[PDB]
Amino acid sequence: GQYKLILNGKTLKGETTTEAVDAATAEKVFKQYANDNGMDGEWTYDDATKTFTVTE
């Protein structure tokens, strides 16, 4: 399925999407991406909209 990430960092903002087998997998992909971009934020996940957020 399609999952969305809202990037709400101090320096990186916007949105990205990934196809993942489940939400746990999307979470790992998105957290790795955030880590690789030096983010350090608080996270949410909304299963109704398949949307993660990372906020600094």
Nearest Cα residue to 54 out of 30, 25, 19, 20: 30
* Residue with the two structure tokens 């992909």: 29
Resolution in A for the shown PDB structure? 1.2
Tokens for 13? 């903002």
Q: Which amino acid is at 11?
A: T
CATH of the domain at 30: 3.10.20.10
Structural domain count, the chain: 1
Separation of alpha carbons 19 and 48, rounded Å: 16
- How far apart CA 41 and CA 56 sit, in angstroms, is 4
For the chain, list the strands marked E by DSSP: 2-8, 13-19, 42-46, 51-55
Method: X-ray
Domain hosting 10: range is 1-56
Contact assessment for residue 3 and residue 47, using Cβ atoms and an 8 Å cutoff: no
